[PDB]
């Protein structure tokens, strides 16, 4: 009864050494090699001494069909580059073959990405860790019966369905630059999962996430969307993230939290148009960390892979409350981090089209909807 919510937290970390070998195709921005770069970097920082490292199991088709349809999972199980010609109709039906291509070991990659998220949820359900980290997870665009936005299987939805076995209310937070449409869609009509997504909105994938989308049915007011413009920086982002999450924690009071830490909201991302640094991105982890709830940290977007490795390495150290030096240690991918070889990055000179009045106005309208909770 003497607990006060502080102290160093127990962190369980999930990684399979085979994840870096899966290849989306020539010129495709999604590179699972970034997960191996992340792992090697934090290994050379010595962070393996402060946390438990687990190798996740390959999630089965039975585990995936807890949300996804039988036909879609069966297609993912069967589709291969050598038999694509015979599946030309089903590929279009399940949105596979363009943004989400067929590649060697596609289903295995889905099993590894999903296995880490569901294993971390089980560990949290068993009350055997404070935090679980799966940088191979966070594929938030996958739908019940189709792939989308480089995502095939929605590890987040499956992990949240696992958490719902022992937690009445689960809070999902998405700082990927894209709207977490796949997660919001799955839980749009239930109040047992509240989804909060911060994202660039307006002529941008996936085209959802309007702030007027607040949920439906029993889930009305349990979907929160903060639409943003190009070039947001650390100060603007930090001025609204903590107040909004604080109000969500007060009104909703969840017992478990899932944080998608998509790194394409960083400055200089190949696909993103934000201007956050690693410190500004990682401040979101610190804010969620303070509330001392069972927390599942997942990966997601991120397509300038040297900055992705920096971001998820630092945010693992943040979860461990470990200060690590700015000078990068030597590692298997040292040349990727030139010409500075530093851990932290500097923002660009791009214009922040999110005026301070815009940020305050959107925040005030979200506070109105948050007042509609019981």
């Amino acid at each position: 009864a003497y607990s006060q919510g502080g102290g160093k937290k127990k962190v369980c970390y999930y990684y399979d050494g085979d994840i870096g070998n899966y290849y989306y195709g020539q010129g495709h921005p999604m590179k699972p090699h970034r997960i191996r770069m992340t792992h090697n970097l934090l290994l050379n920082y010595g962070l393996y001494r402060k946390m438990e490292i687990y190798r996740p199991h390959k999630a089965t088709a039975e585990e995936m069909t807890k949300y996804h349809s039988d036909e879609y999972i069966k297609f993912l199980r069967s589709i291969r580059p050598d038999n694509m010609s015979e599946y030309s109709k089903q590929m279009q039906r399940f949105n596979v073959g363009e943004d989400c291509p067929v590649f060697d070991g596609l289903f295995e990659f889905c099993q590894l990405s999903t296995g880490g998220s569901v294993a971390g949820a089980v560990k949290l359900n068993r009350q055997q860790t404070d935090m679980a980290v799966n940088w191979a997870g966070g594929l938030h665009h996958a739908k019940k019966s189709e792939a989308s936005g480089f995502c095939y299987v929605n590890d987040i939805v499956l992990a949240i369905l696992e958490l719902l076995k022992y937690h009445q209310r689960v809070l999902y937070i998405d700082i990927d630059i894209h709207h977490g449409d796949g997660v919001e869609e799955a839980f749009y009509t239930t109040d047992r999962v509240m989804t909060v997504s911060f994202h660039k909105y307006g002529e941008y994938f996936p085209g959802t996430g309007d702030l007027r989308d607040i949920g439906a049915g029993k889930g009305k007011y349990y979907a929160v969307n903060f639409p943003m413009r190009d070039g947001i920086d650390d100060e603007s982002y930090g001025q609204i993230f903590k107040p909004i999450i604080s109000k969500v924690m007060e009104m909703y009071q969840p017992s478990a939290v899932v944080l998608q830490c998509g790194a394409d909201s960083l400055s200089g991302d190949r696909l993103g148009c934000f201007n956050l640094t690693v410190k500004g991105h990682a401040k979101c982890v610190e804010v969620v960390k303070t509330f001392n709830l069972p927390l599942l940290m997942l990966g997601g977007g991120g397509y300038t892979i040297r900055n992705v490795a920096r971001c998820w390495t630092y945010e693992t150290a943040v979860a461990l409350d470990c200060e690590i030096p700015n000078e990068l240690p030597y590692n298997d991918y040292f040349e990727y981090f030139g010409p500075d070889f530093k851990l932290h990055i500097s923002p660009s000179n791009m214009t922040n089209q999110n005026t301070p009045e815009y940020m305050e106005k959107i925040k005030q309208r979200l506070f109105e909807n948050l007042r509609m909770l019981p």
Partner: peptide, 8 residues
């Protein structure tokens, strides 16, 4: 979401 290709 890839500007170089398609509508994603």
């Amino acid at each position: 979401x890839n500007p170089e290709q398609x509508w994603g």
